[PDB]
Amino acid sequence: APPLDFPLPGVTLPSPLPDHVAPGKTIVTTLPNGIKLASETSAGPAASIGLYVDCGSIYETPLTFGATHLLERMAFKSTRNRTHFRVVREVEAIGGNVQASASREQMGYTFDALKTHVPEMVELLVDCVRNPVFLDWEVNEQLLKVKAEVGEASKNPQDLLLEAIHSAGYSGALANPLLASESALNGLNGSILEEFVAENYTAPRIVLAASGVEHEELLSIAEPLLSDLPNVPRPEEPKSVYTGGDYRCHTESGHILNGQRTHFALAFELPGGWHKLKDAMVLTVLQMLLGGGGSFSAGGPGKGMYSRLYLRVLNEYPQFHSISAFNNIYNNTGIFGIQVTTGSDFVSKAIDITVNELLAVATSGQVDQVQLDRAKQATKSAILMNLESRMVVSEDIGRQVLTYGERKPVEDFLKAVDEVTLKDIASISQKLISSPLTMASYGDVIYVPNYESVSSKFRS
């Protein structure tokens, strides 16, 4: 064989594609039993097939706490038709990846490979989801693994603080922890998981999302397998009412002399969720407007090193470790807040600065036109650059068909983005500030201020 600088002689080259290829349209189809099949055509040689379920952390009665973490962990294992050995062998034989994820509202199973293996991908994924047999010894091994994981999960302060916020600020169903607790890790077994799956994996809560597949072939493959599931009315969604609270817990006292930093956060609540599209998009634009920083990051300049938070805090008080704003839009409910890290000698000052900054955002007339235009451009550019990968488009189709029932074209989101103005962000921020405060802290608790006095610094 010649060196790679000289072409191989006996190859056959399929003809190329035109420089302009009109993109396809999403074709959504529902079976009589409620099973929704969605698909979209793509140009790359790769596919991506997902399977999304409406179950999640909120559907969790106290006798089955911690079930979602294991349901993630027992992802692609011994089914009723093949072993775990055979599943791993099939996946490695075609050369595909496989992954599963679980969050507070919806389950996600994904599987991607090259585009000539579509029937095998569909069949294997549907089998691993629809006919799982939970074997006691495999579940026990997974339980040992999660015990070792949770015992050492105190190396991420960020997610721990976010969980503390979401636990203190709520009272209803949405207050459960997605990560499990040692009680759950000593209460879970195969029967519990099997009953949970049987109860929650009904037909009207499952949608197939594909990224690079013709609709007719995928429908032909997946019609004989999913059409047999019985139809059943969907249970009514649980509820949680926002209730301002406070959380505190000191670190293990073997790590205080090391000068461990102080961490805390603030929070608020939005009456709207994802059904109020304009409010959610305004909230996204506001979050991109606030931005943040890390004092250590080395990524792209376009991350927002000329945002409000960075310039007006870190370049003005260098004592900070890290400031950043976060939000988590849910269905019918939203959240916003700020997380800050600093040593044990600037805490109450940090609270004062952050509450001042929130109220500065609240009052009308404090935002420049350049600021709003830059935030709008950054938000739309981020959305469009996010939509490049096939994984993102499959996940987007699945999540949207779950939530709204139909896919909303990107043009609609861009139009709603362009409608943003100063009065709209002002009114929305007024609605943010009109809600009771949620707070939590970590590290050296003995210095963080009281809840009531800080709460009085705000409005009602």
Added chain:
Amino acid sequence: KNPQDLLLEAIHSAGYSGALANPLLASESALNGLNGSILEEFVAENYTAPR
């Protein structure tokens, strides 16, 4: 195993803020910080005649 003393120490921590808020049953950081010289200096300073 002794929740009563635990609650008493928690009360003396939360309800107070001055010297009376100091811990009596110690924590691990000071334990990693203690040695002979610290105890020697403590005794030398605080075990005086008038007391």
Added chain:
Amino acid sequence: EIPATVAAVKNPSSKIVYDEHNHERYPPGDPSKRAFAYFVLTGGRFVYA
């Protein structure tokens, strides 16, 4: 002053000095000498047989 044993860990230089008091090294670039080793050792394995 920094320890001698830690200055050699965070300084991955590539200029290494061995101890030539007993064994000299071939100049860098020269081939190996595995074949000559087998050559020398067979002459004794014959005798032992």
Added chain:
Amino acid sequence: MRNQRFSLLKQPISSTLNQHLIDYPTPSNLSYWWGFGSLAGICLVIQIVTGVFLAMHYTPHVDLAFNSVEHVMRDVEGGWLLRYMHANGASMFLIVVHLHIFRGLYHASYSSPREFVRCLGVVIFLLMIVTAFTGYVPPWGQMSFWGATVITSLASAIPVVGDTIVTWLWGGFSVDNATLNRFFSLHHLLPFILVGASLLHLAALHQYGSNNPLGVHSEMDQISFYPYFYVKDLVGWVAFAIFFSIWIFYAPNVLGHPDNYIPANPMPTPPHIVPEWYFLPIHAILRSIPDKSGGVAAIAPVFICLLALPFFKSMYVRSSSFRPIHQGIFWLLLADRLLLGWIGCQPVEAPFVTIGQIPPLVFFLFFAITPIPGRVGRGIPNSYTD
């Protein structure tokens, strides 16, 4: 645990050999004075094989023994090679063990925690001496007869039990056929006990590891045994084989007395009776005393001192490199021991009586002096400190 097998060399079948031969940790600065234990093991194996093949052609009777040895040498294919290997390998075996002992004396290997090893070594030495002396008889020459007579009649010097034990040992009234057959059976038996004692000796050493030319703690820098000391042992073995074969093929009678080619004749006595070259120090110490009881009971202090060296408990530095005075005493003891060896092969008159009576005094002043350096030097850090 390792729920599936990795190596044959770590399986239960080969665990013992692996752990005690292949992966065993040894100091990395052992010199060539540490090969003589293995070399002596090979010497013992050579003796056993050669003897098992000589004993297929030898008849233990007074009428036949001499003629059967000569039949072996003259009429069996290669039999001269067997006899020469045996009669010279005894000498090689004694040479190697003497060098081993003096190595142990130099770097002070008897001290804690290695006194069980020293005591087992002394027992092994006694077994070696008995075996060689019993086996020098079966050819039934002149020196065989008269050496047996002198040495085994030296046991009637003891009080009242003397004549009884001598007569019971001889199986009769004089050294004759019964003694010959008895000694043959004992000679065939003792070397297997020697093998067992050697294996026990090695286990006792392996339960603490070896010393080193420095005499310090050595647990921070160790290397395995294979291939690093296997090749050094190989060098030693090949040099030893060259030496052994120079003895066998070009000078096989230099290390013996000519009188053993004359069949035993109880009436005439040889004019100068001596045992082999490796019993002459004991023989000189034994004849150094003008008294039978004293002469016999002067050997006992030799073995008592050799067996009681390890139990002095004040010396703190082992190797003689950092001990000038003990080093000089070591060399002077070596010279004196050679002088005893040379004296043990001379007629007993002037000027050899004084030179045979003083070297025993020096040989005992060695085992008396050494604790005095122990004490006088235990307090050395306090005087020379900076």
Added chain:
Amino acid sequence: QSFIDPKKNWFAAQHMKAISKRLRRFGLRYDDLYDPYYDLDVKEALNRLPKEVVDARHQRLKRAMDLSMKHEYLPEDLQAMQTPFRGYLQEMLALVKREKAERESLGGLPLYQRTIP
């Protein structure tokens, strides 16, 4: 097989009666005679069963061994309350061996190998 079946053959019935009698004497089941040192598949089958079943097996083995040491047999009433040939191990053993075969077909390595004695 045909003749191994008890209900047709007529010895096989005598063989079954003899074995059941010999097992009822010492109060243990036929699946107790299997040994985790023989196969290493019995080890896995017993490593997958629930804890209560293995514990009952251990208690039965200890009872039988004490009886054999003392040179005596269970009383007639506890010999009436016996039931050998009530298995707890055959299906799990078949599962483990079938998985072993299927893994042998497709390359792979064994999951546990015996030591060389």
Added chain:
Amino acid sequence: SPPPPNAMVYDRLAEAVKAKLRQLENPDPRFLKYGSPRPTLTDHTRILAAPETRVTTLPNGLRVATESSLAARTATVGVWIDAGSRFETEESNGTAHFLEHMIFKGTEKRNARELEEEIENMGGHLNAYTSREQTTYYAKVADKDVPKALDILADILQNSRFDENRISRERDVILREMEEVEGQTEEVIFDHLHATAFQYTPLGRTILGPAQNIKTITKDHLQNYIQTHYTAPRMVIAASGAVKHEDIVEQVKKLFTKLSTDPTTASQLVAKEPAIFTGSEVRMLDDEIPLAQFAVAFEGASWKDPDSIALMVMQAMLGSWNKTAGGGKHMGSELAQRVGINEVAESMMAFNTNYKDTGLFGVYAVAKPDCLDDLSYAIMYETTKLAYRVSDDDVTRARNQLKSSLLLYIDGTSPVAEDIGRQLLTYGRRIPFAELFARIDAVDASTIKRVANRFIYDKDIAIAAMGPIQRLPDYNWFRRRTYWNRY
């Protein structure tokens, strides 16, 4: 008289176990129609269609390549340069990384803040990264902003100016970032491996360089580096997404001037000072660390060497393993099965690096100080059984895995532009997917054995270890284990 099979606490549980095992047995054919665990080779000629890569060489030697797709909404524009830390002079060792850091401040027409606020107001961002042989500066933008981004790139590359205060600030920040990187102890492993395998050559050095050298990195040196190593023939401009080749080429031809016309290529600078593999070890014993980490490396191929595909297949068939993976102990390869069944390591990953005229090939495991002997035995045993007894199923599975990986990694505009640029510097041409495949499925068991017996069997090694490695076998153990006496 005996209790019914539900009258005791253990009989009930036994019956439940048997019931579940009966539930597990009988399968459904309609789910067993398309899948099969036995690997077979496929024909992917129906999907490899891609837009054509159009390459244009300007009369200055410069190359412009694109991949024009007019349906997208974002574009990537960048510059790939044939330079790195290999082509320095033993006195200016960290200059490449320093130049990369300081390139984003100068441009006397535009001060730093105004440039950064342009790009943040533009909606896109530009990154950079350097290595021993390839530096890069590229930007992601929207479709309407491509001319603006290309103008920014040309200005920052051509009209850069340096100032002393910025130099001091950069010097201190780079000392800080050197102190930041010594804490993840894997780039340390590979820096020491690269510094022991190639001692007394250019490839032995490190991209960041000494501190005693960053002390004296004054401006004239940066100017000399720019005027010496950024030459027109050695540069490549690439773009992907919603662009057109003619527009880019005309804008480039109009904009890229004032470049130094040095008639020097990489061929002369690598023809002298070649890369020789020596074979040695470095052992760093600490013993206050909980975990040990080491890598053992053979020598590899080059970019144009016809055996790189075989080495890639070998690396695929010696795959990686981690304690959080879903594969577990059924993971296809052999070394992964050993490491996972016997719980001997934390993680491991077969690696493969290619340079022009040399390469590397190794394992890199992580483990506790109690299991190092079994780990090393399994590693070397499998590495050599490669050259003795390769099987057909393993090779077919490795070929399938390599195809799938090499295509799934090309996803998005930035990966596509990176692909085009790097394949125009390493090969001199971008190989279509059809030729990649036609070369990959032409590597069967015989070729695996041949290349393995050329590269692995009875050759010198280089090792580097860190941590509690007092129980790691010595050099001679590894060196002898590279051949078998059974065969």
